[PDB]
Amino acid sequence: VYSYTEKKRIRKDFGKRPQVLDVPYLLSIQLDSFQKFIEQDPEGQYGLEAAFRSVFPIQSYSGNSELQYVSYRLGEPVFDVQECQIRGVTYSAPLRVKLRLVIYEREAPEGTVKDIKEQEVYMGEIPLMTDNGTFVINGTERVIVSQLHRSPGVFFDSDKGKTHSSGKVLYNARIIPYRGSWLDFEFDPKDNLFVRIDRRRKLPATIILRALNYTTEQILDLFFEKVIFEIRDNKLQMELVPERLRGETASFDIEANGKVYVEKGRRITARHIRQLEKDDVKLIEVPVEYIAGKVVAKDYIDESTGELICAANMELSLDLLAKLSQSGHKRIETLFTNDLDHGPYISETLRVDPTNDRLSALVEIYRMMRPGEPPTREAAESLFENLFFSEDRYDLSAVGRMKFNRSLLREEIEGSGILSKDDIIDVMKKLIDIRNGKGEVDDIDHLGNRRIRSVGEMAENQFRVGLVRVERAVKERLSLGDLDTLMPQDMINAKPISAAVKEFFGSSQLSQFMDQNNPLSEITHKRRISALGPGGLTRERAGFEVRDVHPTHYGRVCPIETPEGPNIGLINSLSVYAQTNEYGFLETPYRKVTDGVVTDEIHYLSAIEEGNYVIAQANSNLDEEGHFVEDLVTCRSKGESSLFSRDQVDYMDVSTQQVVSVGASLIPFLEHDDANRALMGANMQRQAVPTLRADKPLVGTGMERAVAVDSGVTAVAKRGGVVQYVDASRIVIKVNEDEMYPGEAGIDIYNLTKYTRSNQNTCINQMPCVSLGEPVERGDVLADGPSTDLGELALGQNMRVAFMPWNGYNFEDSILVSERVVQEDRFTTIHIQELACVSRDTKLGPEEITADIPNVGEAALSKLDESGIVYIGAEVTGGDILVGKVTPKGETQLTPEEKLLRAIFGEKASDVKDSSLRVPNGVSGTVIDVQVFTRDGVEKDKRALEIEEMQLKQAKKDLSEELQILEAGLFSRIRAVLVAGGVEAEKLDKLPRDRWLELGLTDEEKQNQLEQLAEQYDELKHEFEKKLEAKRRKITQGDDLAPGVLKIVKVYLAVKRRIQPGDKMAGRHGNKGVISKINPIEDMPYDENGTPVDIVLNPLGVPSRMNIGQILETHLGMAAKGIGDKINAMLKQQQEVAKLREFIQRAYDLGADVRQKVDLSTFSDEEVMRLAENLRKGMPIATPVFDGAKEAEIKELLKLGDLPTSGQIRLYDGRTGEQFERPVTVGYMYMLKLNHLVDDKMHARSTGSYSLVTQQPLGGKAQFGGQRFGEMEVWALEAYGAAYTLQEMLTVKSDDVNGRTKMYKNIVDGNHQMEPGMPESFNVLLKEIRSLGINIELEDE
């Protein structure tokens, strides 16, 4: 089986581990999220419905006349994606909501309304995610990177011995809900348990217990055990059990049934305990000095006189001895403790507890929560019960409840939304257990503790914020109920809702510009997992362990791809096969393992569900039948890794790539590279710029085809068929009737998107990769895009690189490129960039765009047309006038003696000042699109009229050609549809083509299909005319611009940067580089045959930074190119199809037992010709990431062509023509450009603009600003002996208002010398220190 865009060039594939689960749609993480958010599901689980069902029973406070929710719906997008990008608007959906007003009766507690109003109300506009997960917010293509934060739940995270001496690990727990306020228990070095509220002052944790309506005694019952004493006619026969005995001395004569077993002096052991556990030990007679420190459990008062005998939680003494003796209490309750196991914590907490009852507790926590404000019963009542136990301002989500109930070892993953007394009590218990008994300080980088949000959840949260802050006002307006003077349109305001959602989308920390310069960059931006933003941890104060990799990052987050820089490991990118749970934790696929068989069933696993299991590994052989080839297979039970026998593993890794991401899965031979090198390679190849002729990765990894398919940059067939008419601009697909939907014409029309700017100013572009007359099945790619090539993801060019130094032109990391690469133009890029000339209206008048401009010759204003704007196609150059913009002005107040000169020559002081948009300096491109917007009150100019007419003609052409093609489809339909059931072969073409709509055949389901096709024709033309009139409406109806502006004009330059010394090009393994020289054709080294190397890398790169991957890629790529030119040589001499089929079929075998099977006898003798033609440039070779082409197969392939096995040759210096000693390595390496072109970075400032508050220059190169002579450069000049360079560098050059004129004129008259004065900025600092009361002056004036 092979698809026709795979059948063309079948990339040769090493790799042996069979694929078991295909790499799914790489963008599902956003699509299904936003599908949850914006598809109306009959339930409250997901989407807007959850928000409405949480916020829309609307009862009026004390009015009891209500407003309730019925249903909603998304409107129609006001513009399509294309118009929305161009005009520039958020491609939105009007969010109609059909609410139902229910006015209750006065005296309607029964539920008896008077009447009801029910009416849909437009409530804001949630934007729409385009087909590729990218929203379009203001024309710009935005992406909402999914956020990774801490799950709502309960965490035990004692800090590890920092705050106090002795390394005393102080234990603490937190209940971190979704909505509400935190609640954190913490221990002290005094061994006391305090509660806190969300970083407020401390409080002993039992205050919350006393404020939960708990007296001291029931708190003792919940928290401590009970031991009851008996004065069995003499002095305290106490009840006791051997586990209570465990770990003690012989405090007395340790007896049992009157017989001694541990005499007084000997320490308790486990043999004593177990003996006496058999010995029936429950009660003994012990000395009453044993209770010299034991806290009495409940309150004891003499009931005879009302006197207190001993209060709750107090250690006993002989005072309490005699007190119980006077009333003879036979039982005395205390709390057994043991600082080894049952530490006394709530004991001393109540000791230092200042409050007693619920009222005192409430007032205490009120003075804590809202200081200053005087306490009072009802206020603190409402506050405390609103904080944690109200629905409105508190909610543990489903996530919170699952994680909380599991961390407490409950078994219900469901339950309350708000907290409960059970919650706090059992969390305190578990905390104490962790302290003394068994627990753990779990972790907060464990992906089972970190949940993934997304566009769905976040947009729903912001929509909830909008809805609640509109429901407040609707509550107020529904305070004063009325009958027929208020609808469900005037009690709701769309402003706060849509305002908040536009808030979240337009300006946030997450919704960021898309990286559109590379399908890899695009699809890695969409599936990115950022741990910052509103609700996450900030970059600077983040500190640590979130940044490190954790053993549960296996398969849910790529270890080796993450943005180096001050935020590393905060911006993880999701793994290849990773998915999101229902809840939000990151699950990874695995294959079920039976006894000794590796099942082909796949189970997805959450994060905490790995440690319970022992999991196999992808690099595990097996004898085709589930049974492993070894009895020991490698596994990782919990964190660590070992060998385990065949009958111990339950799950195996689905494929060897699932540890890496879709960014680093494209790196050939990654298994041989340092981790930092895979990191750098991922970062670089994400950033490659799409070149002129997208070549192909000569050594890929077999993931690029799926990567180019998933990122929708290319146009894939949504249905098979035959490509009827191809074109540089569009593809037309005549569908097969196997797939044709019954009531319709067959045709499908793809509009290939020609040169249009990507967000990084690169040139998006699509080319038909299809000839005329070729079949194409579903999912096939018909038109490749930027950096896609027959579906392959091609980013750079494969070049004959040679690893030798060559004269110090690549000293540290430089790269010496030959000029053949500039002559073939195989790094020439394209760089479309807008330029906007806006014509606002100042109070002196408007700014016209006329060609009439002062002070420009005819050569200057030549390339413009009569209306001012530039022609399409003019090859503008640096400084040319693109849009003539002459502004009104007046009242020059001209200097003396220029009035003199003007009087001596008599020229006109034209009131208009030139401010025309010109091309920037250095840029020299060609204008390729000129749009003109207008303020609809403004009358259109000439050229704007011309562009409107052109767009209207083109739109009529487009929609009409649509109608023509689709009606031809209807013809090739029902016309030949006649031949089955009503056949009329040659009486068919006689009557015209409009005919056959009224032909006489058996009026059946076939004739019914004829009528349905013809009426589809009719309605199709009617919708054509409707859509065309609406199109002309949109094209002429006028535009909306920011206020004040009178008309905008835009130019689109197309620049074509070739390459030059400075342009940073690199490879896929971290091998960076900057071009240094660009040698002639000849000075390159050349081999036996005379083929010069193209690029010459530094050989000291390889060992020092361990990345052998580039060398293995070079060897295998040289082998692939040997196969390529062997095929080419066989095909120049028109050998036969026999020899080509033979040799190619030998090529696809290559020794080792591979997972690829190709049978070139099932290929047509003509079909092999297309393939071998595709291979004449060379042979592709895929290499899965960790299970690819081992080196011996590289050797056999290099031997397949007659290339040397060693991979090295003897090169000849082009200059001297004398052989280099010591054979060098040459081979075809895949080198990328990068988007750090020297043209964008080079910048020189002599004397330009200046800031306004401080009289210093401005920022970098956008304002023509100068470089920063910052502080440490001042230190460097001070450490040197320089003193005058420093003075002129901070006085004359930047800040002195007059120094930088007397130093400009002095140079201009050839006299280098300066008059320094005092820098303006110190005068500003003087003024502002003096602007406080702090007087400051200068002595010795």
Binding site: K160, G161, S166, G167, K168, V169, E564, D674, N676, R677, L679, M680, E812, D813, G1070, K1072, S1104, R1105
Partner: protein, 72 residues
């Protein structure tokens, strides 16, 4: 110089430090005692053979490590 070379150097010094600590830990030679310095009991002499200079028996030493396992 590159920004990954520095990461390599820091990881290499970190790994070397951990390994040198662990490797300097275990008893290194060579003196028998035949006798626990906290319980005096008879060591299985193969165990002491494992580390020339074993000063504590398995139970007491495991209990010691368990005890410092909390830092409290």
């Amino acid at each position: 110089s590159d920004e990954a070379d520095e990461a390599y150097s820091v990881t290499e010094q970190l790994t070397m430090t951990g390994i040198n600590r662990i490797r300097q830990k275990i008893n290194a030679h060579g003196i028998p005692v035949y006798l626990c310095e906290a319980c005096g009991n008879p060591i299985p002499e193969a165990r002491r053979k494992i580390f020339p200079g074993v000063t504590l028996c398995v139970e007491c030493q495991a209990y010691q490590e368990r005890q410092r396992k909390h830092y409290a």
